[PDB]
């Protein structure tokens, strides 16, 4: 077999729309390197091509829906790491103040393309904030992510 459940796959379908700028269902080296560096890095095209070739079926320089999923489906379906929480935190919070509040979170969601509500973000944070101080720290995040 080579696939994931509606939940696990949920992130994959969505992710695909995050990588590709037009979300046509395929990401090329042009968009790859663009969104890649957009996060906070300055890699090379070489990685984009090589990495992509490792994911694309026809190896034309762009990954497809099943090609991206199948690759990540054959292995590693559900899991996390202390790094995902740190990197994540950096992806969520722009200034990375080691503490994200529902407000800033809402600003982030809508900043990327998500309309979150005050009650939604507030409930999302308070539910992830073990200390309930209005923000989320490392441990609070790592646990709320996997070690709930």
């Amino acid at each position: 077999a080579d696939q994931l459940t509606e939940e696990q796959i949920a992130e994959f379908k969505e992710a695909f729309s995050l990588f590709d700028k037009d979300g046509d269902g395929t990401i090329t080296t042009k968009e790859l390197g663009t969104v890649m560096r957009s996060l906070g890095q300055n890699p090379t095209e070489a990685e984009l091509q090589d990495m992509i070739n490792e994911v694309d079926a026809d190896g034309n320089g762009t990954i497809d829906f099943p090609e991206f999923l199948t690759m990540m489906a054959r292995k590693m379906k559900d899991t996390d790491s202390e790094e995902e929480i740190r990197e994540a935190f950096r992806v969520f919070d722009k200034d990375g103040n080691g503490y994200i509040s529902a407000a800033e979170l809402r600003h982030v969601m809508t900043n990327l393309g998500e309309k979150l509500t005050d009650e939604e973000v507030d409930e999302m944070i308070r539910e992830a904030d073990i200390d309930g101080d209005g923000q989320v720290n490392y441990e609070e995040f790592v646990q709320m992510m996997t070690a709930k």
Binding site: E11, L32, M72, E83
Partner: peptide, 28 residues
């Protein structure tokens, strides 16, 4: 930083998998 896979790709894989977890599948 994967071991022998796709950095940018896998990077996105984890990032998305993380946010999505807090996006909806958080307190399910």
């Amino acid at each position: 930083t994967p071991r022998r896979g796709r950095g940018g790709f896998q990077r996105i894989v984890r990032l998305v998998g993380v946010i999505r977890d807090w996006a909806n599948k958080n307190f399910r």
